[PDB]
Amino acid sequence: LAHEIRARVARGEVSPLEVAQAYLKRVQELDPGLGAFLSLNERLLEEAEAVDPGLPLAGLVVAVKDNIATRGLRTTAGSRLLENFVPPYEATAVARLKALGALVLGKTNLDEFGMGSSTEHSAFFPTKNPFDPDRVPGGSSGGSAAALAADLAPLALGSDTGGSVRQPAAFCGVYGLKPTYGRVSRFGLIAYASSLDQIGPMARSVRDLALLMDAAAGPDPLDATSLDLPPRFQEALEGPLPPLRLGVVREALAGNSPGVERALEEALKVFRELGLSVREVSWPSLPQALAAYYILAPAEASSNLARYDGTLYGRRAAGEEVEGMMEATRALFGLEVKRRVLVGTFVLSSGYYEAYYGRAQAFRRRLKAEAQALFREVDLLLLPTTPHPAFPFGARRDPLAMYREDLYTVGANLTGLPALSFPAGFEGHLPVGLQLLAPWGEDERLLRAALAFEEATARAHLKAPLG
């Protein structure tokens, strides 16, 4: 629907100002109940929507996750520490969309600092799943997903560290891409695990994902970890193998819910009638990756969130003593954050560094290896984004049960591989999603594959009306 809008705009049938007014209204009427947006781009939207021409993304408006810097707009990262913080600079990704006519609708709700898998850890309020108001939209990009599924926005930006983009996309029945680590800039991302974080696009169609990535991705002189690889995404004008080899991961086959297994089998039939060589492969240590993640990520998180004392920009807790002030200000963290940064401090702490961090590092290198070897025999990998559909609020009381939400999604980040999450059915009016993987840098290929699947069927629905 995104590319459809830009079409109507370029032909003069509609003006960008018209599109904004339309979406702004829808938000003001539906968001109250949904709770997808934290902040909204004030008068600076209507004003900015009437001072643009015929650029590629003119009529488009984007919903950005609130841990991504937007100059002049409140960027809270879903935390109390930053509930009044407004960046004097703009995230490279966002900056690029803006230069192509795009505009920010508002900022999306997330789990505090991106650490969460249900949005139930937002310092402000939970977000509701448009398909079922009694169930979570996933996390931590729960807001962005929820916004898309309710057509509160044509485009959306999210953040992925352990599936924070894929898991929500699955729960809300939309597309979520985690780009090869290095494709999109991290400058402007209030990130928590530097080695694993990546801004990811999400949309209601694969052609739309192409629009975002083509605009957002690319080398940034400010990010020393960014790759010099031209996007070239919108060349989804298919000359697609036929005949790619697809490898299904055994380890992720057992433990899935009826609707996931069902959606999985059906997808295979589809890829076969498409000309793909489907074969079962082995991801030996994949099941043990969840552990390595919850020792590598927390480690980096402790050091990344260390800067949040009340000295220069956060909230000040009021101590009057400085050490005491720092100690009191950080107490404003949520239960989940505290939990993770306490783990992170332990894993790096003296006497435990090699025993844990050093251990998880060596294991992280195994996965990359086992993956290199797998892509010597196959061209794509397939598994569920999650073993089940969105769960109802209240479950996942045990912090561990929450972590195991990212059982299948952690592999992507730990290795760095591109991973796409596409809709693949419904476990009874509940959207279930499947996860495609490709070798490093072959983002465009898995999108191309995603198109074939999408075209081979038309299976995507919107819980709320779409304008």
Binding site: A224, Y294, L312, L342, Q361
Partner: protein, 83 residues
């Protein structure tokens, strides 16, 4: 293998002051988590391709915009409680 003393030590290192209620709570969580992670198997274990930035000046923030983030400022300085 996690004593209440370590928690204290950790919360010290992280400069995070939690309530005695949270301490008892997190004490149980951390235990379970550190057990889950400890299950990680040990295994045996690249080329340097990093780049450098040119020594060319880039415009700075205007003092006004910088101090606007500060909870407390005084005569062009960031103001914090005393040591």
């Amino acid at each position: 293998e996690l004593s209440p003393e370590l928690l204290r030590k950790l919360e010290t290192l992280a400069k995070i002051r939690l309530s005695p209620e949270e301490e008892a709570l997190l004490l149980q969580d951390l235990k379970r988590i550190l057990d889950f992670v400890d299950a990680l198997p040990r295994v045996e274990e690249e080329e340097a391709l990093g780049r450098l930035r040119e020594d060319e000046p880039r415009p700075s923030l205007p003092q006004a915009e910088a101090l606007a983030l500060a909870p407390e400022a005084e005569d062009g300085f960031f103001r914090v409680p005393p040591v």
